Design an enzyme around this catalytic site. Sequence first.
Site, PDB file in Angstrom:
ATOM      1  N   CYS C 152     -47.719 -14.455 -14.931  1.00  0.00           N
ATOM      2  CA  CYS C 152     -49.173 -14.569 -14.888  1.00  0.00           C
ATOM      3  C   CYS C 152     -49.826 -13.300 -14.362  1.00  0.00           C
ATOM      4  CB  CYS C 152     -49.583 -15.767 -14.033  1.00  0.00           C
ATOM      5  SG  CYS C 152     -48.695 -15.944 -12.476  1.00  0.00           S
ATOM      6  N   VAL C 156     -52.710 -11.325 -16.396  1.00  0.00           N
ATOM      7  CA  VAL C 156     -54.072 -11.252 -15.878  1.00  0.00           C
ATOM      8  C   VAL C 156     -54.563  -9.812 -15.860  1.00  0.00           C
ATOM      9  CG1 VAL C 156     -55.373 -11.428 -13.740  1.00  0.00           C
ATOM     10  CG2 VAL C 156     -54.151 -13.413 -14.613  1.00  0.00           C
TER      11      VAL C 156
HETATM   12  S1  CLF Z   1     -44.553 -14.430  -7.871  1.00  0.00           S
HETATM   13 FE1  CLF Z   1     -44.690 -16.382  -6.684  1.00  0.00          FE
HETATM   14  S2  CLF Z   1     -43.729 -17.874  -8.089  1.00  0.00           S
HETATM   15 FE2  CLF Z   1     -44.358 -16.125  -9.402  1.00  0.00          FE
HETATM   16  S3  CLF Z   1     -46.524 -16.692 -10.462  1.00  0.00           S
HETATM   17 FE3  CLF Z   1     -46.575 -15.357  -8.482  1.00  0.00          FE
HETATM   18  S4  CLF Z   1     -46.955 -16.839  -6.751  1.00  0.00           S
HETATM   19 FE4  CLF Z   1     -45.974 -17.918  -8.518  1.00  0.00          FE
HETATM   20 FE5  CLF Z   1     -45.969 -19.089 -11.198  1.00  0.00          FE
HETATM   21  S5  CLF Z   1     -47.106 -20.086 -13.120  1.00  0.00           S
HETATM   22 FE6  CLF Z   1     -45.059 -19.283 -13.826  1.00  0.00          FE
HETATM   23  S6  CLF Z   1     -43.861 -19.164 -11.880  1.00  0.00           S
HETATM   24 FE7  CLF Z   1     -44.921 -17.113 -12.122  1.00  0.00          FE
HETATM   25  S7  CLF Z   1     -45.412 -17.050 -14.350  1.00  0.00           S
HETATM   26 FE8  CLF Z   1     -47.072 -17.528 -12.816  1.00  0.00          FE
END
Ligand code: CLF
Lengths: 453, 477, 522, 522
Positions: C152, C156
């Site tokens: 994400c 973004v």
């Molecule tokens: S480093 Fe940590 S776990 Fe990663 S996103 Fe960022 S806060 Fe979350 Fe989340 S929904 Fe899927 S798992 Fe990511 S691509 Fe985004």
Amino acid sequence: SREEVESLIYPEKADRNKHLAVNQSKKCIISNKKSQPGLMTIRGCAYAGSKGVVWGPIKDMIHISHGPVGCGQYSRAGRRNYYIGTTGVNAFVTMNFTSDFQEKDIVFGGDKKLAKLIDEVETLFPLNKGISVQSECPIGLIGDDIESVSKVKGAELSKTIVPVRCEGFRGVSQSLGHHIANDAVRDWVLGKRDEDTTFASTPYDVAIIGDYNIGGDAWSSRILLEEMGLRCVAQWSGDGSISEIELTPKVKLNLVHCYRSMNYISRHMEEKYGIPWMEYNFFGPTKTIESLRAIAAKFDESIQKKCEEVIAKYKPEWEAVVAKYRPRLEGKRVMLYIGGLRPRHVIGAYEDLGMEVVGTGYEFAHNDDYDRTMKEMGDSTLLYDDVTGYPDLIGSGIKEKFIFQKMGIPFREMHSWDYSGPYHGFDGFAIFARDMDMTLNNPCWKKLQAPWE
Amino acid sequence: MSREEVESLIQEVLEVYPEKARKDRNKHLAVNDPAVTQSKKCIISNKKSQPGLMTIRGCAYAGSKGVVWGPIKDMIHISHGPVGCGQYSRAGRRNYYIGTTGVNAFVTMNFTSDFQEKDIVFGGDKKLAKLIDEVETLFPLNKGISVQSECPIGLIGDDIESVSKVKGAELSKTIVPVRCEGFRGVSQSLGHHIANDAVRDWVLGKRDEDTTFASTPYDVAIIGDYNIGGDAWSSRILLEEMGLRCVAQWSGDGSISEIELTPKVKLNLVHCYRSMNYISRHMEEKYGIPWMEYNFFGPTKTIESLRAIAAKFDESIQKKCEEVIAKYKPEWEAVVAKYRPRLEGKRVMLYIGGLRPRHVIGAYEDLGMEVVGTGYEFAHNDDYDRTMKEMGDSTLLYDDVTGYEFEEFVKRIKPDLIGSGIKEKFIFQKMGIPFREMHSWDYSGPYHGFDGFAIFARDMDMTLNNPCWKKLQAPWE
Amino acid sequence: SQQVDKIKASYPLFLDQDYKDMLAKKRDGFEEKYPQDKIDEVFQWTTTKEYQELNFQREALTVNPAKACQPLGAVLCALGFEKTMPYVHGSQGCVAYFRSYFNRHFREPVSCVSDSMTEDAAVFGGQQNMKDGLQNCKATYKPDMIAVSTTCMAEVIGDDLNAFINNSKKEGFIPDEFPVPFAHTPSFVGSHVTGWDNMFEGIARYFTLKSMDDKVVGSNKKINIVPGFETYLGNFRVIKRMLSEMGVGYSLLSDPEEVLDTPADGQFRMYAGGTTQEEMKDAPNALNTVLLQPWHLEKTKKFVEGTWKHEVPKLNIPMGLDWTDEFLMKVSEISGQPIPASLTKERGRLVDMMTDSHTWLHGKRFALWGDPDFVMGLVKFLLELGCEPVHILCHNGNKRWKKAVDAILAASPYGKNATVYIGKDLWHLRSLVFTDKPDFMIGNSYGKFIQRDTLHKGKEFEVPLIRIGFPIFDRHHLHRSTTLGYEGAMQILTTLVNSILERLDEETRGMQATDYNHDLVR
Amino acid sequence: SQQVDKIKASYPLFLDQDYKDMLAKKRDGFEEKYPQDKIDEVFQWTTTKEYQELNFQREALTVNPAKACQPLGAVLCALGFEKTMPYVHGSQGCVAYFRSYFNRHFREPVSCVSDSMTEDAAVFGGQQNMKDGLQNCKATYKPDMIAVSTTCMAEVIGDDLNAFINNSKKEGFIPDEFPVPFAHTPSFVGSHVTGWDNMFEGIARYFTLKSMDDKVVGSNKKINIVPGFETYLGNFRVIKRMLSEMGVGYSLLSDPEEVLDTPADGQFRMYAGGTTQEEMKDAPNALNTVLLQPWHLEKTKKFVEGTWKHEVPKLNIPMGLDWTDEFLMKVSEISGQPIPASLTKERGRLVDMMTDSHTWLHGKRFALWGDPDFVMGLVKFLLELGCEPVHILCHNGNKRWKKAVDAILAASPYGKNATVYIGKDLWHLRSLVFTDKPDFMIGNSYGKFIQRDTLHKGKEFEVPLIRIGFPIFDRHHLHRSTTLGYEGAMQILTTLVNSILERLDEETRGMQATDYNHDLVR
Ligand code: CLF
Ligand code: ICS
Ligand code: ICS
Ligand code: CLF
Ligand SMILES: [Fe+3]
Ligand SMILES: [Fe+3]
């Protein structure tokens, strides 16, 4: 038509023609004769008719399969004769007590082994209220005398021990087993309270004979009978105890469900104690109402008034069952093959669901059962006695269940209720209609042909 | 293995890296020297991971939501952002608790804003406010809400502090905005720091002017024990048996009221220094509460920690400490007698996150096992300062080890047992080395205290001496 | 205290009197817990229809979802290619979570790398991260191919995967001829199945888009099989076995069954099996392409029909009797190979099993959830069995899929009381199973919690869970099962009927209370 | 009373208040039942060690045996040959019971006939019965072979099967060339596995004893496989699959898997598959004969060694890792075919599953029963898993088998608390699981009753039953499972670990009581 069925009806000896008929039964069908050897019949043995049917459901008694291990093992908990009790403590219906005959027991006899077994049964199961010894095939061939052992051990332990000479080779089917077990009940259990007058009797005392509580059928009958104002003093064998058998000679009326397996004892009770007996059919709302009215007709007007109350109370329930399930079952034809009573006792509910019965037959019934069956079936329908393996629904046992299943015809187990039930009474009618709908209208019967074939 | 052999092995493992990657990774691999007290002279830690090298480190969200805030049971924690981060972390950590899930406890549930494209384009502040309203509607017995930010939250300019302030003022509810976006920092350590800052700023000082709590001289709080399989419970029973009153538990089986009552205790017992040193130092400088690190891994460390803790109180507490040690002596002695002959002389290689690579060494040594290699995912240099004196001479130290690096180290060293996480467990089970999950206790536990030592010894013996490890080679090869 | 001869783990160690006393002291002294009567009141409230009305009014709050993010599916797709490393451009915590999820479901190693983008990369993009990560990955893990998806954070800030990879090849970080397919997998769009679709379309486009001049449809006499997001190894195995039985030449694109079922023979295999690059390059030469899960392979279907000129058949998931029959007949029509006698016998054996167990299965009520194709195939099979799928939930479902499932339900007498929910989570399903109680739930391991909740209301209100789907964490080796074809239908039927039988046995085990129905024969 | 919208079967119809009151009235008025306090006291007494001491002193009484009679095994052996009718000389009730037993286990039609010997045969013998039965059976069911066993009545009265069949051929009831193998199966000797051994030895002696002059060992480059009494179709399938993978020519003698797994396509097949008469005639030409279940194939072993001149290997049942390895290695040595890489990968995958599940499997205590070879293979596999088979019961075992199992247990540190019982029944095992409680039971459906009894003592004393063996009546399609080879080992391991995990989930489902251990990930 009758001509077509006759044309439809084997070496020169294979008799079979006399056991097939188109609907005095003796002039039309011949029954209760020996099976043709090597023909894959359905019939059981006298041991099955005595141990598995008449004596086995008695819960507070311990039944010893006297002989080799197989006969007792194959009949263990195979019949769904329901009961209430603590198994292994005060009830022993689903347990298998056997003498497990070995070669030395065949060579030298098992009478000493039987006495030692009875002692061990007393030691390990103190709350048993009686012992029955069901003989298997070798017992009557090696010269064992279980009557003397039973007498000696009963005198010694002050216990009721009933020797049953129900060797499988005796007779042609389970019918002789029913007769032998009934004679054993008469000789060893029935007359135990002849000089006892401590029982408080009422004018509405009835006993239920020949109902084996398959899935709880006897309970569904008993709730209707007691709602009617009657008192069911005895109910054997299904959920039956030895005390109920002993108290049966104290009732005012005998209600025989299975005439085939208990007509002997009913007639004996009528000759000896003067107790009138009659048959009742609680299968389907129509037969249930007819039987309830007939039973109430044997008592005073209060019982008839309570019978009318019960019929009125249960009318909306079975009417709703009919309204729900009859539209899904109109115009469906049924053929049956069950042991000795059900082939004519099940027609009522099929007609109550809009179904037409075009075939029925008996494993081991006698010509009187076919006399009763003739009027219950419409004309031009095939009747078969002890038919070998060689419509929309077929009602029969487990062994033909899979044959007819693979031939593609929806099938219903009319012995164990296909592990469902009860089927008697109004609640039984509801369950039976639901099961008929679930079996006949299941999609599994529409998928027998592969779409590329 | 001698020092020169370990250095040579490090060189061979690094040989396959590109120039920049090899130069960076040479600073994170070391040969242990127990006489060295300044770990920055031998190892460098808390740095960026080399891209595309299969690291084990998580994110700041994992260190904040999954570690510090998630174990709080009566609070509802919103994974603000897309669905994935909250989904993969749901009930994945065995921080045990007591409560009715969905009514008054919400640890194992997944509350998320489930961001979509419109939430990314136009922001999710209105969605956060409506979500808080729906949380209040559907979970009325929650005693607070935290909002753990995922990666998109800090990149689309969402102001969750303002939403938290307005909704907390409106509902008279504690709403804690945690800026734990995953891209922040280099590992879970910054997540621990951010979560500690959030606790300090939103929860800790709620009862600063309150004085209704009845305090006793023997008031202690357990900071940094997350009750993995009941570890904090096994530590707390020992602490209460010494006559101490444990007021707070951070954060396993922890309630928000215990956090609010922590500034009232007389001592802070910090198990995980790495994730709670920030809040412990803050509490020292503000409320004057001293803090000390304890170790309840194995019987000798448990006894030493119990005596050190009792030395901070009067002589009655020391008498009770001696009574507890005497009571539990036969049980752990029986455990040692049963299991040490089955485990003596075996070699262990460890790789865990930030505290256990050095805390569990005493438990292994209590059973006769030597630790030959250890390392951290996200520890700082103070953790290594505490680690070198614990480790033996000429042993291996790895910081943020890569899959290739750690696999090659295992291949050359050939340990009897490996303790690491789930992403190496099956690798090493296929390599043929008995493996024990040192993160979730392999769905066993607790391992803390005397009651945990029996389970630890039994599990080590069960895994290390299992017949399956003798059946990996087909008899026709 | 512990007994060395009988050591207790947390259960039942914490049921001891001293531990119970300590926990009670903690709760009564410092937890400030609500009184137990209030907790019971609120629980009973949560079990009611009023709470269901409040719950289904939710617009911003999601509780206990039944879906994951796109890069998880992208990683699963990338694992199905020969010596291919999944590479997720973005933050490393995402990759840690992906690997942990797949490790817990499969109990196998899962290879996946990240370029570890940080706060600095949030300002100037992840170009340097991509260059260094591609070079490091190729040098360290030596893969034949690197399949690139995004997190994400990378989506973004708008990182251009194509430009970044082209620059990486331009500066010499990776060879220009090295295959680096890419896909944009935004976690805020769709779910993991969408990510699988995006990654597969990216790989197919990378290998076939620019080399369509020499391609002739049907020139290799094979059928392409695209399985989609599949977490049952038995499904890959059964599709391959059935296609081999028919004599049909096939090309299973994205086959991860080998790398997810490596043997334990003393060595660790990072790569094993998988679809080869030659198969992907030759895929446009196939007779046709069959998508096993068409409801999350829309982009793949668009590319295959638009670029490969393959008239992709309109086929449902080969789940259950009728849909397996249709899949086999379609394969027979495409390839020209008749359906052999072995498959006919297997179909007949499945029908025999259906007939043997129809008494126990008929009329049973099921709540169920999962992915769109899996859910619709399970509903179809349940309707074939005479069961009632009362509650049909698909968090990642859309309106067209719901319309298709409604059309399926309207064609059966047993779909009368069935309702299809899309965009609803497992808290919605908890409310549904509390207010309209079914006989059983069918879903992943998360449903276990719902079962717990039902048991709290009473033993008569408990809804047992049947673990079919993804992810299954609390059971071992269930990922080896099969759900496709006649074999999968037989496995599902056995699971369902035997779950019914265990429930009946448990409800009739009370001695002198309910054991009159504790039948030896069922 | 019944609601038409919700119809109750016996359970829970008879839990209704009116039914409960009527049953209470029955019990209080006419049953003369022992008081509930006496019943509880006697049950508690039966759960104790004094009762166990009395129980194990039993000499003449057998309660709940774990074995059947010989003609059942003879029928199962006869069912394994091509177009062969099982024919049991004796009483018809025996055949009715045999067919009902096999129908309940396999849920398939079972073909078997009797000559319906009656009291008339009790005096003059069943010679006329045999003549008429053979004639009628051949005329009606048109088999290629009629395999004749005996019931206890025919054995007691001393009917000469050889003379009877010879007279039937001489008087023209059957052709002189029609194959009628026979075997004496005295139901008071041994058990059903003995009957299988006797029937197989009789068929082999019929087809091979008079034509040994032209037989050369190894002249057909095949290995004979004799499976013994086997009730899992997967066992036949796995043996054939493993031998086909090795490229080994084999002849499976008595293969009944086809007739016990007939498809439901709308027609009834009384016969399907089976060992052909040509295979049995060419059996002496094989390289060797391998007995899958050597401990109930003693007579077959003597015949094969003394007549066919085959050096039968000393192989255990191919159950579990080590014994499957030795079976494959012996087959490779006999046939000269190397063990292929597919079997090596399968073994490695089994070992991988073992390593995955060893934490949950380690230290678990087991009570198990069944046939000798099955029981010893299960014990060996349980020892390989780090489990503790505390109770090892075999009603049809002998002293030599007990010695072999004791030697197996002594070689493992996990067999220290293990005791082997022979000649003991399931009442003995009930006493054992009460006085020395194991974690689980492994056995046929009868053990379910034992489970009920344990639940009567308390939930903390309940011993769950894992259904592996014969006969299984209360579960559907478990006869399709596999217990042999690596595939059977994987199935058994999965069943064991998942039973453990289901029990743990049930124990930890209590909300705010034990659900702290209700882990999502196990
Ligand atoms: S480093 Fe940590 S776990 Fe990663 S996103 Fe960022 S806060 Fe979350 Fe989340 S929904 Fe899927 S798992 Fe990511 S691509 Fe985004
Ligand atoms: S006793 Fe008889 S075969 Fe009358 S042996 Fe048989 S429980 Fe049948 S037709 Mo099974 S003469 Fe009862 C019978 Fe009828 S066992 Fe039941 S169903 S009404
Ligand atoms: S908090 Fe930290 S990785 Fe100190 S993020 Fe991690 S429950 Fe580890 S070594 Mo999992 S710094 Fe705790 C930890 Fe240690 S989740 Fe647990 S085991 S003692
Ligand atoms: S007709 Fe009836 S069931 Fe048959 S033996 Fe005779 S009493 Fe019994 Fe028994 S042990 Fe086996 S099953 Fe027989 S061959 Fe003997
Ligand atoms: Fe694995
Ligand atoms: Fe079948």
